[PDB]
């Protein structure tokens, strides 16, 4: 049949003056482009076939060739930027948007998929898909009373394509396009399918990856409680983007951070900060670092939820990248915390693991740690307890480590170390 054609046979059929021969050849091309390994995308492009495929998208009378050509072009567009560009340069964008209204669901779905690949290439093609008017017809496909009536695979493809329209920066998507998509996104975030939920969270994570005004557009829709709920999901593909979005939101204002706290997020972090997946631990500690950078009453919520011992834990043992985020979390905590809060930190065991990290060959974490020590002494001076702290650091080998850092090449390191030695270790 159409299994395993040569490119030149495909060309021969598509150049015939016979719509059925063209359909046969287009299907043969689709099967080449769908094969497991090394689909001959460039050979198909070089054969000049994209304009033919694009013209087949418009053949309302032959729905099968619309489908086969849509599938073929989707798989060309799934490749490199240059391959996606070839599809765009053939006029595919407006042709696919017209197919979103097709009465055949499998064709409309394929057009959704193709536009997701095109938009997923980057900012420019994303905004070009939007300028051609794709959002209106895409959202119209989801204007049903109950999303459960839609085919599962259909809804997943729609959610995935919408998330690509939210993706990428420099520039971020147009504000008006974000406002247009967000209400449907909030609704998908409440759908029961794990894959729809994962991609809805990715979309929100993209939209919160920016300045505070972008975060505000999302938080104002009231999605933070649902994000915290998904933060506790058992599916890692859901937790990962949900945590990224929460982490993005707490890089905003302290008022935006407070919405996350109010929603109950901190109760999830005992398991997140011990999660077996190192990337979850890292991003959970990163999130914590931008909560300890907030107000003293927000630091106090971290204390109340029992999370300071968990920060001691990750500082003591974790992937180094996670340990570096934990160091940041401690420096922010000691920078903004009360004296009582900093005292509590020391009583939880922070000093020893903090000192042990001074032998790391990363000059940035050393700066961060030395700042934290300085902040802790400042809290101790206020209590007249410098010596006790000085002794505690000595007993665990910290003084040896700080003494050597006077010999460090980095200027900040050897200034801060010498400053510490002079003031507190005499």
């Amino acid at each position: 049949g159409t299994v395993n054609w040569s490119v030149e046979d495909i060309v021969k059929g598509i150049n015939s003056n016979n719509l059925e021969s063209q359909l046969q050849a287009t299907q043969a091309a689709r099967k080449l482009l769908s094969r497991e390994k090394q689909p001959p995308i460039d050979n198909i492009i070089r054969a000049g076939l994209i304009p033919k495929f694009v013209s087949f998208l418009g053949k309302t009378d032959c729905s099968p060739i619309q489908f086969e050509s849509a599938w073929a072009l989707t798989n060309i567009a799934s490749g490199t930027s240059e391959q996606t560009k070839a599809v765009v340069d053939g006029g595919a964008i407006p042709a696919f948007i017209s197919l979103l209204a097709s009465p055949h669901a499998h064709i409309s779905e394929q057009a959704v998929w193709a536009l997701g690949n095109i938009a997923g290439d980057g900012s420019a093609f994303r905004d070009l898909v939007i300028k051609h008017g794709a959002i209106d017809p895409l959202l119209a496909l989801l204007a049903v009373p109950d999303l459960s009536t839609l085919a599962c695979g259909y809804l997943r493809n729609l959610t995935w394509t919408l998330s690509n329209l939210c993706r990428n920066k420099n520039p971020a998507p147009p504000l008006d396009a974000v406002e247009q998509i967000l209400p449907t996104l909030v609704r998908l975030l409440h759908h029961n399918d794990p894959e729809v939920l994962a991609d809805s969270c990715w979309a929100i994570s993209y939209l919160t990856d920016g300045p505070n005004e972008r975060i505000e557009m999302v938080v104002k829709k009231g999605v933070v409680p649902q994000l915290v709920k998904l933060l506790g999901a058992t599916e890692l593909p859901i937790v990962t983007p949900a945590l990224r979005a929460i982490g993005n939101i707490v890089t905003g204002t302290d008022e935006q951070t407070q919405k996350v706290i109010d929603a109950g997020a901190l109760a999830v972090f005992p398991s997140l900060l011990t999660n077996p997946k190192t990337n979850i631990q890292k991003e959970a500690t990163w999130t914590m670092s931008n909560i300890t950078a907030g107000r003293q009453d927000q630091i106090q919520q971290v204390v109340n939820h029992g999370l300071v011992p968990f920060l001691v834990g990750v500082l003591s043992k974790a992937d180094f990248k996670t340990q570096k985020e934990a160091a940041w979390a401690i420096t922010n905590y000691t920078s903004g915390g009360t004296v009582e809060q900093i005292v509590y930190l020391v009583h939880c065991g922070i000093i020893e693991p903090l000192m042990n990290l001074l032998s790391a060959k990363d000059t940035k974490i050393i700066q961060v740690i030395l700042d934290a020590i300085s902040n802790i002494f400042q809290a101790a001076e206020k209590l007249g307890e410098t010596e006790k702290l000085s002794i505690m650091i000595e007993e665990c080998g910290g003084l040896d480590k700080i003494e050597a850092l006077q010999r460090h090449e980095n200027e900040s390191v050897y200034k801060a170390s010498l400053n510490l030695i002079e003031k507190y270790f005499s």
């Binding site: 769908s34 989707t74 998929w113 997701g116 995935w160």
Partner: peptide
Amino acid sequence: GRKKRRQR
């Protein structure tokens, strides 16, 4: 995500 190729 980013891009997806359809295989079946």
